[model samples]
Target: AKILIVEDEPVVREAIKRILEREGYEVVGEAENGEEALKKLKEEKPDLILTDINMPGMDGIEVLKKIREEGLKNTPVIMLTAYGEKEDIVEAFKAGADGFITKPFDPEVLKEKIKKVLGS
Candidate 1:
């Protein structure tokens, strides 16, 4: 499946991309910040989106909001966060997140979660 990665950190983004590639998923696009993420979201129309919650400009919550606003509901979004705070989790879900994966996650766990989210 094609996936879009929205992360500010270059290393983390590259790591995830490589891992997904090893897992046989296509890395359709990568974005450093939320605005760019939105742009790529439209351009790529990926099957799934993995987004970091904390970003410089338009955070992941705002990105998810725009995704919903623009009727991109077919694409599932899985939040990647280090916070692990209840409020943030609640807000993400409230904003229509399909799932979440905590930061510093195992590549195996990430793969499993992606499979679960994609129902494969």
Candidate 2:
């Protein structure tokens, strides 16, 4: 499966890339922020997108809005964040997120969440 990862921090992005690659999924594209993510999305049709919420310039919510507005409903998204704020979580779902995961979570757990989101 192809995955597009969007995260501003290089370390976080690299760690996620390593984890996904180790699990045998192709990291087809990556982005530092929502604008870049949308641009990459236009270029590649990934099976799923894993994105961070608090990105600089055009946050994850905006990316979600753009994707939905552009008719990319079939593409699932998993929102990743270090935030455990209840209101923020609610907002994420309100914005059409398919799944939500907090940061500092187990990498193995994340993989399982992805599988569940995909109905695998």
- By TM-score, the best candidate is 1
Backbone clash pairs for candidate 1 read: none
Q: After superposition, how far is residue 21 of candidate 1 from its true place, in Å?
A: 0.8
Root-mean-square deviation of Cα positions for candidate 2 versus the true structure, in angstroms: 1.9
Model 2: per-residue Cα lDDT over 25-69, one tens digit each: 789998988877888887898888898877788887778777767
Per-residue lDDT tens digits for candidate 1, residues 12-88, read 88988998898889999999987788889899999999988888788889888887787875689898875563458
For all predicted structures, in order, the TM-scores are 0.89, 0.89
All models, RMSD in angstroms: 1.9, 1.9
